[PDB]
Design an enzyme around this catalytic site. Structure first.
Site, PDB file in Angstrom:
ATOM      1  N   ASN A  30      20.489  -2.069 -30.036  1.00  0.00           N
ATOM      2  CA  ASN A  30      19.874  -3.344 -29.666  1.00  0.00           C
ATOM      3  C   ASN A  30      20.688  -4.470 -30.351  1.00  0.00           C
ATOM      4  O   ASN A  30      21.176  -4.271 -31.465  1.00  0.00           O
ATOM      5  CB  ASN A  30      18.407  -3.317 -30.143  1.00  0.00           C
ATOM      6  CG  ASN A  30      17.370  -3.767 -29.125  1.00  0.00           C
ATOM      7  OD1 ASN A  30      17.419  -3.454 -27.944  1.00  0.00           O
ATOM      8  ND2 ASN A  30      16.368  -4.484 -29.578  1.00  0.00           N
TER       9      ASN A  30
ATOM     10  N   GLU B 294       0.847  -1.184   0.000  1.00  0.00           N
ATOM     11  CA  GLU B 294       0.000   0.000   0.000  1.00  0.00           C
ATOM     12  C   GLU B 294       0.886   1.238   0.000  1.00  0.00           C
ATOM     13  O   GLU B 294       1.830   1.331   0.791  1.00  0.00           O
TER      14      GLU B 294
END
Ligand SMILES: Cc1cc2nc3c(=O)[nH]c(=O)nc-3n(C[C@H](O)[C@H](O)[C@H](O)COP(=O)(O)OP(=O)(O)OC[C@H]3O[C@@H](n4cnc5c(N)ncnc54)[C@H](O)[C@@H]3O)c2cc1C
Ligand SMILES: Nc1ncnc2c1ncn2[C@@H]1O[C@H](CSCC[C@H](N)C(=O)O)[C@@H](O)[C@H]1O
Ligand SMILES: Nc1ncnc2c1ncn2[C@@H]1O[C@H](CSCC[C@H](N)C(=O)O)[C@@H](O)[C@H]1O
Lengths: 230, 582
Positions: free
Chosen positions: B421, B24
């Site tokens: 990449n 929370e």
């Protein structure tokens, strides 16, 4: 009458049923008419790939494990290969070994026993006529057994074997023991009786060896099945 | 029996006897804090948390469209981050129309869990839950706060229990309790809940102490009195926050163990207070793999097991750009289309002008840019003495599989092959390999070699000239900002760069190269020059005009080697290109 004399006029025992598969697995002499080129399950001549494992299949069926189709462990052959090759040129083709067969009822126990050590590597599935269904397969999912990888393309997966399709195929896979073979013989004649004792109360089996970069273990499953029975 | 969302999801864990955890959090009062907390949500999500709870207060405008508002924080947690959230809600100083509008807005944002709170100064949470059920039926989860030691405003504890009865029976699904200091308190009020006919599952809430402000914060939040033992332990160490973190971790571990060993606790709620270390350590002390991308997205995305490789160093932009879809790809990628361009944050985890000290304040020439890529790939400090943590396309340190492509990759990148990449060929390694072992643990994993880069007009020309000598083996794609497109891939089909073989399963292909979605990555890839690195410089300058020239005229290029059991030809195709230049 075309296939009766090729499958034998009279059956003295299960050995006379085994004697029909070995004469399909090689072109060989017979008491009359020599070679047989057919079984109820096997309308194709043996594919050229089968020459990799013909001696093993002859061994297996002569030991009473009645093979009705197979594949070898291929581990990425060139697509262009005349024995094992398909799809676009220059790519690769792969397989898992496969071994589908019937056995005498006593032998299914033996097979399940020896699978207690191979039940990680070997996907297995046993089934009697009316229904008696045993497997280590994933509950639902198909197993891919022939696939290929091609330059600039998506992965193609032409051959797959699975528990639902196998449980459907089983309803033909027993019926033609009667509908093709058994219906040749006289009503409750000793040949019809040994065929009915082979139709009913007899296990259809499937095996797949998933560990394809290794040598095919399905021959050792059967050898140990035999050993155990012995 | 069948299962679905709502209680059935947690009922699954209840029946399976699997203990879980939930976190929370609180909404921040600043946008920078909001970005930091979003990154924190991403970091905690790997801890296998059931749900994320966001607090609600009226002073902060939670129902508004401000980014700091709780509603947008929750939406970002789910839609653009892929994490189930449970939205708290309070109705003090609110009317029917306002609550209905806020609930409708939660509807539109995909929010489906709502927590009912009464707040402090529609008179009770009973009204809120009943109105939610009446106006929106059972579409939403409803959970009500539980008060173990009794509400401070209540005269009698049994009356509080009866009110909890009514609130649970009205529309509630789950009950969450507040702070505790003794486990036995959990047991007594749990037994009281059982004896009153309340059959909903009760989850205990935990505040982990992390500092001296925690005691005051705990007292203010729960209005409870800290035990003299904890204070006495903290009092002689009143200026050693780190030590209190260890002490509180020990105490929380003891409390959690006592709660879990009971068997009446199905999970735990931890009040993080926007702090990570203590909660993560507590979770680890109490005791990633399905695809090479370490998590597939949560909301409406259980179907995703294939996506294009282009975004794989930068995944959250793919999720955001694809959030319009229903056809989240499973099977051969063959269908989902990024017919899309967007408004953006485009911010790193470093502040907006802070990382300027790692990319350089002063680009002398393109030969300075060529070192920023190589300094990143090498893990080497710049001329300033600062190690480059990222580049605009690839906010991460690059992956462990690309350690195989270290020395050759940075060597060819020096020469103006600006790689963004890349990937090794793998040749059928076992599954559970230390650097490529994804999916079911028995099986094999396979990959093609892949390389993607920007490069100069001359070097791109050269490469177009050369690739004819490998074009049966290498698929190539080349594009620029002007839309000039040249490629040798068959009918623009996808190209299956990664796959795996697993016992009893069909063949799995989790990443794919695709020359059509490269048109949708292209725009993002080129814009990340000007919109992150160009705008980091002043509006008219050598560094801006250098970056605008790179944006204007470099090609973006991708290559894939199809003979994956043989040695990689991408090494010895760019070198075959460098030769040609001279
Ligand atoms: C897990 C949790 C989450 C919270 N989240 C938030 C949040 O997001 N935002 C926020 O502002 N605050 C939040 N709070 C604070 C909380 O709202 C306060 O405790 C508040 O003072 C009361 O809310 P409640 O839902 O517990 O009220 P209620 O459960 O309704 O209890 C308040 C009082 O109402 C009385 N009462 C209830 N029903 C009746 C009845 N039928 N007849 C007579 N009397 C009745 C009870 O005796 C009780 O003392 C949270 C608290 C917890 C424990
Ligand atoms: N009784 C038997 N014993 C062994 N092999 C058999 C057989 N009957 C047929 N076969 C062989 O089993 C093979 C199965 S064919 C299905 C697989 C196919 N080769 C593919 O990968 O696409 C056939 O090619 C056939 O040659
Ligand atoms: N500047 C750069 N140069 C080279 N490679 C980079 C890079 N930035 C990121 N990369 C790497 O690009 C790769 C794309 S993802 C590779 C495919 C995927 N991992 C698979 O599942 O097979 C990542 O491994 C990433 O680490």
């Amino acid at each position: 009458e075309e296939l009766l004399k090729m499958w034998g006029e009279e059956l003295t025992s299960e050995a006379s049923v085994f004697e029909v598969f070995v004469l399909y697995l090689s072109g060989e002499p017979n008491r009359n008419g020599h070679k047989v080129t057919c079984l109820p399950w096997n309308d194709e001549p043996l594919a050229a790939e089968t020459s990799l494992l013909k001696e093993e299949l002859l061994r297996v069926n002569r030991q009473g494990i009645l093979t009705i189709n197979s594949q070898p462990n291929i581990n990425g052959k060139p697509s262009s290969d005349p024995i094992v090759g398909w799809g676009p040129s220059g790519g690769y083709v792969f397989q898992k070994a496969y071994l589908e067969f019937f056995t005498s009822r006593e032998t299914a126990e033996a097979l399940l026993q020896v699978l207690k050590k191979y039940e990680l590597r070997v996907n297995y599935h046993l089934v009697n006529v009316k229904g008696e269904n045993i497997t280590n397969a994933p509950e639902l999912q198909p197993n891919a057994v022939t696939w290929g990888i091609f330059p600039g393309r998506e992965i193609i997966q032409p051959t797959v074997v699975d528990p639902v399709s196998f449980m459907f195929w089983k309803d033909e896979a027993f019926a033609l023991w009667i509908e093709q073979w058994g219906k040749l013989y006289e009503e409750e004649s000793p040949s019809r009786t040994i065929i009915q004792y082979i139709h009913d109360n007899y296990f259809l089996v499937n095996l797949v060896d998933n560990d394809f970069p290794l040598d095919n273990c399905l021959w050792q499953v059967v050898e140990d099945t035999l050993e155990l029975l012995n």
